[PDB]
Design a protein around this nucleic acid. Sequence first.
RNA 1: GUAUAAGCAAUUAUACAGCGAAACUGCGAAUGGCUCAUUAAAUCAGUUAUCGUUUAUUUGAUAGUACCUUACUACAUGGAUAACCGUGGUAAUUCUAGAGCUAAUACAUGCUGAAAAUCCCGACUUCGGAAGGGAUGUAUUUAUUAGAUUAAAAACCAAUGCCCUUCGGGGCGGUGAUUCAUAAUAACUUCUCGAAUCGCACGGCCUUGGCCGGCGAUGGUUCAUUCAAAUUUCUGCCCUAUCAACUUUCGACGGCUGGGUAUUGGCCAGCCGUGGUGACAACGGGUAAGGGUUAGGGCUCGGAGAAGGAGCCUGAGAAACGGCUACUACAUCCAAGGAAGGGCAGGCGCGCAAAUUACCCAAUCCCGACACGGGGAGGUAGUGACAA
Lengths: 44, 174, 232, 140, 662
Amino acid sequence: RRASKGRKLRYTVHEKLQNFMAPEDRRSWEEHAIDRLFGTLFGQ
Amino acid sequence: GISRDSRHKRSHTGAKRAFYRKKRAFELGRQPANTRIGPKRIHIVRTRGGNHKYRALRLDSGNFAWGSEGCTRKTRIIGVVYHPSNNELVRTNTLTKSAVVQIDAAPFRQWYEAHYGQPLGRAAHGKVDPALEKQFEAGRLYAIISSRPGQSGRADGYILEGEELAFYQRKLHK
Amino acid sequence: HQKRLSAPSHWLLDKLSGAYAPRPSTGPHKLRDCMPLIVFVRNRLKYALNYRETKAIMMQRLVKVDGKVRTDITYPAGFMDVITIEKTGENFRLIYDTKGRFTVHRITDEEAKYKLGKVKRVQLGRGGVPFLVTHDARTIRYPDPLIKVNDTVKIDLETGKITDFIKFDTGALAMITGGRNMGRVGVITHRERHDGGFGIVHLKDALDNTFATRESNVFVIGSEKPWISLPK
Amino acid sequence: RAFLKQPHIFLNSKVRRWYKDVGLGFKTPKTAIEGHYIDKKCPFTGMVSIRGRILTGRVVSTKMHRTIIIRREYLHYIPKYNRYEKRHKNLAAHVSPAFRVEEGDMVVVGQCRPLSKTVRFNVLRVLPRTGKSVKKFQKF
Amino acid sequence: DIELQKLALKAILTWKSEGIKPYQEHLEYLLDEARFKNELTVLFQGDNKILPEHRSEVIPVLLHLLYGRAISRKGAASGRHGLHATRLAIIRQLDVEDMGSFLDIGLGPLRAIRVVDEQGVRESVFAHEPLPPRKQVGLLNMLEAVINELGTSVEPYMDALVNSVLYCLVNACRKLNESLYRVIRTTALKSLSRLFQNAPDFNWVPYRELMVKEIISPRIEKLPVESTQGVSATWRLMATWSSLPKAAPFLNVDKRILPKIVETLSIEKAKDEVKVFALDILKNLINLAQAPETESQFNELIKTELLDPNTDLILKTIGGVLHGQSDIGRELLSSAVDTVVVFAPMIEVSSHIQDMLEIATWLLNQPLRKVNPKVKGAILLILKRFIELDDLQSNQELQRKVYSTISALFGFFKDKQNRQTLAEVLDVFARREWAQEVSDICRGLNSYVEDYNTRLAAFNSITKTLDQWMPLVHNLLYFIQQPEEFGVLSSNSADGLCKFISAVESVWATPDQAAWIDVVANIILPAIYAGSRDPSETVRREILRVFGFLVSHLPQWELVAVSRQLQALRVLEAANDKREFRSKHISQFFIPLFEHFIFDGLSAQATNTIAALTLSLEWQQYRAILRRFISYVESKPDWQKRVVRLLEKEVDALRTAVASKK
RNA sequence: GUAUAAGCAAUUAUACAGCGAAACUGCGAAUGGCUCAUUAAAUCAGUUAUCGUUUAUUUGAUAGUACCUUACUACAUGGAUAACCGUGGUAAUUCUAGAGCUAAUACAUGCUGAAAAUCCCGACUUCGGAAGGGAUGUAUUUAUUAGAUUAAAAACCAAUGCCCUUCGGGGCGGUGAUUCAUAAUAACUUCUCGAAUCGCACGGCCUUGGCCGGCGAUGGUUCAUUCAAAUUUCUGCCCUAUCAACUUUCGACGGCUGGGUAUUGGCCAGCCGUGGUGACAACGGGUAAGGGUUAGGGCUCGGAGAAGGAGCCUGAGAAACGGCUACUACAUCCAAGGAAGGGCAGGCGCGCAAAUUACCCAAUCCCGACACGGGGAGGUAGUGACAA
């Protein structure tokens, strides 16, 4: 194949790259406003 | 991290060998230098035997040879137009070897009108290819870089002319 | 700092020079093809006894090699380098023998005044001038225009001027300086080109023994004309 | 890609083609002389020079860009059998577009500076025969 | 002085001005002695160019600083890269109005000088020196660089430049302390030459005595003896003078200049380069003398004053050159024959055309080693333009000699235009004179050179008298040697040669016998051998036909189908053994024929005939033959068995030969 | 090479002179050696190449490069620091602060006595020596040209000839190869070198004011040579098919283009092509990791780490473990603010056991400004009923 050197996304788990950071949820909004805004974007 | 040894690649028969040794000093290959356009920035690197080689990182001027008539001049460099290796390099305006780039034409036109006499770009020995004449009328020629800016510290090369000139016009249009 | 046994067996040391042996310093002659000055003084000539004695003798301007005073102890003097000692007024020259060992010869000033050196190569130096490289690492500027590779030159040793030359020739007598038949004085009778590396010559003696030595090891001494006094 | 060129011959002049002989009793072919093909690893067009060992062999896989694979057969003496045994060796050599490649022919190659991990030789003179496939065995 | 420069620039920046304000970094970086070239090339052709608004406010201080950096001797290294490349760089990057203000700065006292007045010379100016010669050397080198970088933009600055350089040149020649004035004179003439071919449109007429004082006084009485070595700057000035149209009539002012030029050409101990240089001066003179209206504004004088009173000396000297020494370089030869080509239509009457025609036929019978065939074509054009003067009726022995040459050139040339010019020189040959006979030759060669239907008509018409015949013989054997278009030209030329040899055997009166017999020998027999070595098989067939005609019609002359081929070869064996042969006949006709027969039982019959003929021939020819055969062995690996069978048979013949001669 | 030590030791013409601590400058420490998970033709050994690269030291030669508008000029070159003297801080040793000096072979610039200098040509010539004509280094990098008798090479080659004669005769740079070596022009470099150095003798011309004058030491551009180092070509491992498929899973095989490397190279980045290896034994597995010197035995030669990862520094040669930098794991001093640091050898290892904590670089050998300084190889010595 033409693609060995990273050219295709090898969906393979990485050992050292496994558990770096825990998700810290930092969002000041109660998510109802945000997805109601995603509804009421330009399109509606 | 960077080295030139061939231990890590596979065998000629397609085998993998451990061959575990340490990276010594004579397989050292230094980090690349994206020579870009700017004021003159050159870092000196001493190498084996105490030789000096000049890694040029930011370059403005180089010299170019219009040796068809037998002249060469130090001119500025506007910006790369095409490069055979990497379109990312063409984007990031890098100067390497064999790099076609538009250069300023003013010293060449000065030398032409001084030597032969007729104005150009505004007898029978002073004759120009018409594509080169169009380059002169625009005032920004197509030249090539053939000096290694990384391992020589200078952007020098010959002007494009004739068959290579038209080939590179067609390549630019591609 | 090699051992006495691992030292080359053609500059001789007896069974009492200790387990060690000097290594030659860097100089004109090669490492394997060298005789150092201390070994020439105190092991072959025995004009001294000890390293300190040889140090003192070489420190005062008393030993002259190839017309120039040599200071340091282990200056290499490999092959056909005249060694003038003025307090004895003798001149010694280094040849080989039939077995392949260093042999010292005594000479007076008339034959001691000149050297015979094999030409390594010839090129054009800086400025567009031809220069000539001997095997003694001597460079002669402005040579005779006929002296090619593997020629031999009689050298003045006082002005370094090219006094004479001898040509590589089939039908000439030679001396061997390498190979398994090293040190067998005889006549060149045949040359074989073998274009592609390692040309050979076929060299017989004066007494009907043929053998194959390579041109690099061949060292032209003279057609008959033994310009240096070989030992009788 | 860029425009290919011999390194220092001035083309666009308003007023040639350089090719050197390797020597060793070889003759440059006419396609190398006049054929406008250009390549850096050709000993008659590029700057590669040939020196050292000169070898022969028979091509097996010509299906490659200007590089052939050569089966080197020889007779291996094993002491346990006190007998000669056939052993094939797989080389490579940079093939010039000057010659007419034939599969199964007899080709003379020459040692050069290392052009690739495997490519260490240049072809000099092919000899056209009727060599067959893998099933043919012969010392060469 | 760089420290005084730094303090001066600090003072100018103390003059706080909005004009100098955006450029102070460029000024200090131009002034810092480690940033000069980079600061220059960032000043000019950079992003921050000089704005044209306050350009009149910044340019004077910048130009004085540029003069300081171009005058500095401290930091400069040696060589041209030492300070000469610096001056060239500054002047190349400068501009022309800036150059005018700069040369105002450069010419200190000599800015307002007048070298020429309403009268001719200003001796009151020249007998007073305002400058030391060191500053004059600097000024003059500076101005040479200025002119060399300026080119055609010199036009608004002539009224200062010519005054400066002429004052320097005339003070130098009056000083003719020697080294300074010498280098002054040489670089002065160099700048003058560049100035001349830069500015043609200037009026140079208001001073003539200046060129007089520069040229005639010190040199002309010695000029060949001096210029025997190489070209000079005076020679360059005269060359560009002859190149320019309006500058050429300055050579009339002293009338001995062109005589002494061809006297340099007369001295045969020159390095040949001054010879071809004076020759190119004459080239430009003649091209000017032929040129249209733009040069016919001066042609009538240069016809009537420069070339006319010296054509005799020109041709006498060129003859002394072409008959003085046995060694002439090919460049000098081609260039001399080119000058006489261009001089030919420029003269109408002279005195030495006898000598000219003799030298023409001399250089035409010169061998091909000394003279190239292109050069022989040039002498042919010379012959056409030089024969038409009324001279040939006197001294007929010269005239039968030159006609022998033109005939000889008919089988030599290869080029159609050369053969057209041959037919033309034959045309004017007939126009000069015998006349109707040579006009018959004119129409013959005209319909020879004209295409293929006309050529075959020519062959048949002449198929339907010695000097009539000889050129037809020459072009006839040339059209033998032409192999084939359809082969018809070869066959018709063969038929014509049979007709000629029939005329030959027809006429047998004893002085006609002698003349025609020497002619047919010395032109036909070597042509037979050359066509024998010719590998064209149609040529060999027709040469066998004409050789059969020769041997069958001649025989009183003292020197004379596989199955049928082999039978005829056996007949030839029997002819050998009944009569051995003539040795030259063997060695130069028969051997190459069966050599061709081999390399194209035929081979066995061929080598048997070669065996018998190697018996028949002479040993010295045999020695060369055997060396050629072993050379065939070494060089031709195509027929190993064939050549070695030839070797076996020929040395068996040698063994029988020594056995018989025992 | 640098001495004004406020250091000694003196005088018979007084800058210095003999010895000379400290200090600056130059060299040196790519090993002598220690430990331990191992390396199964990749190392290694023969055998080649470097026309693909580097090299301090070695020895040999070596460099013609002026003038060129400063001129109403310039003509014994600059500035810093150390050692030193004095003022201190802290618990903390050059951990060091402030102040006052002075030298260089340390760091650095460097037109000038002059109307010439130096190369090439050389006509005329009394070997006369020359009238007068052209021209102004090196290193880097690029471009171009030459790198060699003509290219209308239609030459030379058939000298098989031509001409005389007595007919006997006579006359007519290197390589196997390279764009190699080398030379020349255009410019280019924030680019070098082209001796502002030291010791010793001291002689010729006599403008008695100097002008010339030798031997060395140190230094410097190029090219050799040496010592090396780097890759690199054909052959050669022990055993096994309960190892027949392997590689493309760090590109696997090409070619082109560049980057970096001292240089070649999928060594790496783009672009496209389709491979390459294998029953002649690939690949895997096992770990038990010799060559040459030929009567013989003897003799000689033969990966990873310095508490742990990671990065950097000097130098001709190191990824030195010598240093530093941050993280981690330890440990020490303290006035609790802070500071420096990491190895080997010996004894016990039951409560009961057993070969020196020896001497010198004396010889061989090594490293230095260097005859003199310094060497953990080397020899000398002591113990022994294990034997013999």
